[PDB]
Each structure stands twice: as structure tokens, then as C-alpha cells.
């Protein structure tokens, strides 16, 4: 069976409990994780240890908190007490875990299921070929010896409009923002990097990225996490918002792909 779980955010206990609920069995089953494995929850170290141990039985995409963790590890960015990353950063296996984490994709595609996954979703300004090239380009920098320069370069809110002519720092920044920070779009597909609220509270003319017709969403289902104020609701057919805010006292949500059956694990917080 195929299971897809939203943002874990260090909620190791809830993750294991939900997987036991569906009797997740590596070798017979595969797990898709929407990223944001770490931060805020208390168990980031245990979560990374377990997901890494799953090997080919897990298909991960990196989220913005995974990238932030990597920026803190590399000395690029300051550690915020509230993220609760210190046990992981001080672990004897921190090197093994984070060097594994930076090698994971930003984008997962299963052609037989016609299923795409990314942390924040797919901007309507990308077709599939472009999304794949963009993921490849950022994954190559993240997996290189020089990844701390990219992590330093990634911070920023501009440019917020895609063009095949983007070059250099702006190109990587847009790609990173599109995969891991996107929520709202302007009618032209342009990214808005400030509004984090539910779509009801969003100011006009902002609309969820999934409310704008785009070539990937027209051919593929898209699963994503990240947007917790969505509470997993209000999406159109074929759009699966999996982040139900477990670290926030919400719930950890698991979707079984074969029968579209949902399983939910309450926050223990
Ligand atoms: O910068 P980004 O990269 O866009 O991401 P982020 O909002 O800072 O954090 P995150 O990726 O964890 O997303 P989340 O919605 O959980 O968190 C973003 C913000 O959403 C808020 N939030 C969580 N649930 C919400 C809800 N139900 N309604 C409104 N806001 C909510 C949280 O306070 C959090 O500060
Ligand atoms: Mn996120
Ligand atoms: Mn998140």
C-alpha cells in the first residue's frame, strides 16, 4: 500500500502511532512524506533517524524547515529556541543524518499513479518538465560540497514571477520559494510571500496556488503539506493538502492512495 503523511514537525510519537494504525510494513508498503520533518515538535532527532532508516520504503520531499535546519547546521543561520533542534544538532550522528537529508528530492513523481508531491505544491507557472528541471538544479546544489553557499543564497522573497530567462541567484531563490514556501498566488500565477492565513482570510486578489489552473495540476494529482492554516480542507479534486498541523495541537493526517482512505492521529501535545 501507498501512504502519504503531512508535516511531521518532530512529532515522532504521533508518526509512529499513525503508522501502527495502518500497519505500515516496509517491503509491502511505501510512505510519502511532505517534508518539514523537523522543528517545533520535540522529536526531530528520532524522526530523522527513523525516516532515514526506511530507505527505499520512503519518498521524501524537503520543506522549508528542513532547509532551515540545514542552514543552522552549516552555520548559515541562527538557531531559534522554539524550533527545538538542539538535540538533533548535538547528536553524534548529526553529520550522517543531515548529509542524508540534504540529498533528498524537492519533488516526487509516480507516473503510474499520476501523482506529484512537493512541500508547498506546484506553482501554476510550471509545467512538469520545468518543475523537474528546477528540482534537479536545486537538488544538485544541496547535494554538493558547496551547499552552505546555496543555503545562504536561498533567503529572500524576490523574484516572485517565473520566467525561463531567470538566471543565477534569483532563479534559485524563486525555485526554492515555489517548492517550499508557496501558498497564495496573484491571478497571473505570481507568488505572494507574506500571507500565511486560510484562503477565507486572504486579501484580494490573492488565491490559493491550487485555485489557478496549471498544466501539472490538470494532468496529475498533487499532494503537499506546508500550509497548516488550510487545515487540509477547501481543495479541488486531485489536490491533497496533507498538513493538518500536528505540531500545533492539530492532527497528523495519513492518506492511503489505493482507496483514498484517511487515517488521523491526534496531537499528544
Ligand atoms: O515562511 P514559510 O516558508 O511560508 O512557512 P511558515 O509559515 O513560516 O512555516 P510552516 O512551513 O511550518 O507552515 P505553517 O502553516 O505550519 O505555519 C505558519 C504559521 O501559520 C500559523 N497557523 C497555524 N495554524 C493556523 C490556523 N489554523 N489559522 C491561522 N494560522 C495558523 C502558525 O502560527 C505559523 O506561525
Ligand atoms: Mn512548510
Ligand atoms: Mn510545516
Swiss-Prot record:
Reported regulation of activity: Co(2+) is a strong stimulator (100-fold increase in rate of hydrolysis). Mn(2+), Cd(2+), Ni(2+), Mg(2+) and Ca(2+) are weak stimulators; the two latter act synergistically with Co(2+).
Catalytic activity: P(1),P(4)-bis(5'-adenosyl) tetraphosphate + H2O = 2 ADP + 2 H(+)
GO MF annotations in UniProt: bis(5'-nucleosyl)-tetraphosphatase (symmetrical) activity; bis(5'-nucleosyl)-tetraphosphatase activity; hydrolase activity; phosphatase activity
Function noted in UniProt: Hydrolyzes diadenosine 5',5'''-P1,P4-tetraphosphate to yield ADP.
Family annotation (Gene3D superfamilies): 3.60.21.10
Keyword field: Hydrolase
Any one annotated GO CC term: cytoplasm
Subunit and partners: Monomer.
Superkingdom, natural source: Bacteria
Enzyme Commission code: 3.6.1.41
Family to which the UniProt record says this protein belongs: Belongs to the Ap4A hydrolase family.
Protein name, as recorded: Bis(5'-nucleosyl)-tetraphosphatase [symmetrical]
Lineage: Bacteria, Pseudomonadati, Pseudomonadota, Gammaproteobacteria, Enterobacterales
Claim: Hydrolase is one of the keywords in the record: yes
Gene Ontology biological process terms in this record: nucleobase-containing small molecule interconversion; response to X-ray; RNA decapping
Amino acid at each position: 500500500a501507498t501512504y502519504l503523511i503531512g508535516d511531521v514537525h518532530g512529532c515522532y510519537d504521533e508518526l509512529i502511532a499513525l503508522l501502527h494504525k495502518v500497519e505500515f510494513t516496509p517491503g509491502k508498503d511505501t510512505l510519502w512524506l511532505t517534508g518539514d520533518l523537523v522543528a517545533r515538535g520535540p522529536g526531530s532527532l528520532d524522526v530523522l533517524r527513523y525516516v532515514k532508516s526506511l530507505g527505499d520504503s520512503v519518498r521524501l520531499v524537503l520543506g522549508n524547515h528542513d532547509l532551515h535546519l540545514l542552514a543552522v547546521f552549516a552555520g548559515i543561520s541562527r538557531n531559534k529556541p522554539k524550533d527545538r533542534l538542539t538535540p538533533l544538532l548535538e547528536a553524534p550522528d548529526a553529520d550522517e543524518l543531515l548529509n542524508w537529508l540534504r540529498r533528498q528530492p524537492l519533488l516526487q513523481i509516480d507516473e503510474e499513479k499520476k501523482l506529484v508531491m512537493a512541500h508547498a505544491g506546484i506553482t501554476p507557472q510550471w509545467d512538469l518538465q520545468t518543475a523537474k528541471e528546477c528540482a534537479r538544479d536545486v537538488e544538485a546544489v544541496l547535494s554538493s560540497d558547496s551547499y552552505p553557499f546555496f543555503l545562504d543564497a536561498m533567503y529572500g522573497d524576490m523574484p516572485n514571477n517565473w520566467s525561463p530567462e531567470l538566471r543565477g541567484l534569483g532563479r534559485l531563490r524563486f525555485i526554492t520559494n515555489a517548492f517550499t514556501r508557496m501558498r497564495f498566488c496573484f491571478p497571473n500565477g505570481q507568488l505572494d510571500m507574506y500571507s500565511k492565513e486560510s484562503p477565507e482570510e486572504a486579501p484580494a486578489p490573492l488565491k490559493p496556488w491550487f485555485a489557478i489552473p496549471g498544466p501539472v495540476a490538470e494532468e496529475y494529482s498533487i499532494a503537499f503539506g506546508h500550509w497548516a492554516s488550510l487545515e487540509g480542507k477547501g481543495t479541488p479534486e486531485g489536490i491533497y493538502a496533507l498538513d493538518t498541523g500536528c505540531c500545533w495541537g492539530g492532527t497528523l493526517t495519513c492518506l492511503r492512495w489505493e482507496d483514498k482512505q484517511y487515517f488521523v492521529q491526534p496531537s499528544n501535545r
